[PDB]
Ligand SMILES: Nc1ncnc2c1ncn2[C@@H]1O[C@H](COP(=O)(O)OP(=O)(O)O)[C@@H](O)[C@H]1O
């Protein structure tokens with residue numbers, strides 16, 4: 178009974194899951210938080226947080242490695258999957274990790290400094306601790322590499338693109354890829370002749386247009402800051418406005434970089450919380466700013482969903498996914514009602530069902546476009562890639 | 572036979588037109604360019620440029636005033652219309668100019684430094700030269716004041732909005748207003764129950780969603796730099812990307828402000844010209860970058876047109892206007908073909924007709940949405956407002 182160890186190293190954390198190769202089910206999950214801090218810990222399934230105080234990425238993973246051995250899981254780990262934030266234009270699909278891949282990942286890392294280097298730290302650690310184990314790299318950007326130039330180019334001088342690599346990349350690639358595959362099943366669509374819009378709505382949020390199985394447009398840009406307004410991220414924002422704000426408050430780009438990434442979006446408008454649940458209750462209790470934050474959030478989602486549909490020859494479905502897309506009854510309803518122009522019809526009773534109902538259709542029959550909620554499973558998608566690559570002769 | 576003198580003062584020019592109150596036809600037009608420069612001139616209808624060397628906004632208008640007197644037009648000027656770039660949240664409609672209006676215009680001027688002060692210079696000059704003449708102010712932003720908060724708010728901290736006035740304003744207001752009024756006629760639509768998308772495509776470009784006669788979404792933002800990619804303007808651009816570019820080339824925001832306003836868009840991508848005509852020929856001749864610039868330009872227009880449609884309850888028509896929208900056969904075709912998802916059907920023979928054919932429908936019957944070209948006439952719209960206001964008792 179082989180298992181797949183899936184890893185995701187962030188700037189200050191290391192999330193992991195152990196999936197059964199046979200059923201792709203989670204057998205164990207955990208997270209080492211407070212990384213590089215004088216006080217780091219490891220909590221597995223909730224079990225009392227261990228003391229990983231003063232430990233680097235490798236020790237943290239060494240601790241996680243011991244927790245797998247203390248549960249006789251070590252010997253059944255046949256594959257390891259690493260989630261990589263940015264793959265530049267070098268990676269269009271998941272790959273078996275070798276020295277060349279590591280080199281390539283370093284090459285594109287300048288494009289995602291705050292994430293890629295942590296991803297690499299994770300790779301080095303895993304390689305040290307599981308030498309005889311095949312390891313795979315899954316890039317959050319690879320699914321969007323099918324985008325045409327007209328869809329990934331910015332209106333900046335050509336030089337910025339050709340010599341600096343400035344262009345739209347998009348993220349949530351693994352989710353958008355996974356969810357759209359699931360959609361062809363659920364909606365009984367022919368992948369080769371289909372038009373889908375996936376709305377990945379989490380604390381990080383993005384839209385993706387999948388035409389005939391391929392991503393043809395996505396909302397995030399060179400960085401995860403473009404597109405939809407999010408939990409603490411601003412989303413699209415007039416550069417002239419950002420420039421004006423700079424001259425008025427005497428702030429630098431790093432100051433504004435912080436504001437737009439940490440103090441904006443839902444948090445910034447509501448001045449209350451980045452958490453939707455908190456905001457939904459706030460609205461219910463009469464909080465005006467919480468209502469404006471949500472309304473704005475919904476307005477921008479509807480706008481991009483419609484905008485992205487322009488890259489499809491035909492619109493067959495709109496799929497909601499992510500923590501927010503899977504659990505927010507109201508947001509889904511508001512977004513959908515904001516898209517009546519596309520002929521969407523919601524089945525409120527179906528939309529009311531909690532996420533325990535899994536992959537489900539929430540639109541009524543008269544609906545011109547099918548609407549559904551499909552829980553995303555990036556760990557499973559990564560494992561499936563690893564399993565496939567596990568049959569290769571490298 | 573009274574006439575209306577219409578003025579538009581830019582940072583370095585003063586465009587003017589004299590329309591007949593009876594037919595709203597242009598009887599004279601001109602432009603004083605090279606303002607504040609050691610060499611300024613005044614060209615009327617093409618007539619040899621006069622020597623306005625070393626002259627401020629008032630002298631330039633004094634020269635224009637003499638050209639109207641030298642043609643016995645002075646005594647028939649019953650109204651003067653001033654085009655104002657930015658009206659903030661203070662102006663929702665055109666107004667008769669008084670001391671209060673001037674004060675108010677100064678209040679919002681910080682929002683458009685490079686345009687509003689020139690507009691005010693024009694007002695002071697005109698007021699000096701035509702004391703007994705009623706004068707009106709028409710704001711490029713007023714038509715978009717009907718936008719809901721969810722549509723004009725940015726995902727920035729609430730403070731930036733409430734204390735600094737940072738929000739979407741939108742421009743091309745007079746064109747969008749004028750063109751949509753014309754559309755209800757041409758398309759035989761009931762203003763009170765209608766959904767239109769107007770694509771104002773000139774060297775400056777923006778989209779506007781008009782629901783039941785009111786603007787409910789527009790593409791430009793606090794400044795004319797947001798939205799569509801334009802002649803030399805970038806249009807939407809990932810702020811994280813702009814930040815990244817800053818740290819890589821060691822440029823400031825003023826440096827980037829310049830790049831995004833002067834060296835980007837069509838010019839930036841093609842590295843050839845900002846002029847569509849030049850680019851269309853370049854493409855025909857095999858120029859790849861010119862083709863990419865146009866394709867990108869078209870892709871972004873289609874995206875925003877679809878995105879803006881989300882603010883409509885029903886999509887009745889898409890109207891093209893502006894120098895590009897009125898004369899570009901190819902761009903209109905490409906944009907429309909990029910919107911097949913909305914069920915649009917183009918009548919190529921109708922779309923081929925030159926702008927001399929005026930207000931015209933270019934979509935075929937099977938089309939779910941009517942498409943048309945409606946030449947814009949901002950001077951006429953301004954005159955109509957002035958004429959209406961000419962009956963007021965101030
Ligand atoms: N029942 C719910 N109703 C509304 N929002 C919810 C609900 N459950 C979770 N959320 C929101 O979803 C967000 C976090 O999503 P995230 O976990 O990052 O997505 P993913 O689960 O795809 O990785 C939070 O804003 C959270 O408050």
Ligand SMILES: Nc1ncnc2c1ncn2[C@@H]1O[C@H](COP(=O)(O)OP(=O)(O)O)[C@@H](O)[C@H]1O
Nearest residue numbers: 772773774775845846847848893894895898899
């Ligand atoms: N026949 C044409 N085909 C393609 N583009 C054209 C044509 N005529 C003018 N243009 C373009 O339209 C643009 C300038 O538009 P503009 O004059 O600012 O709009 P408006 O006339 O609404 O004020 C230029 O890029 C120009 O090359």
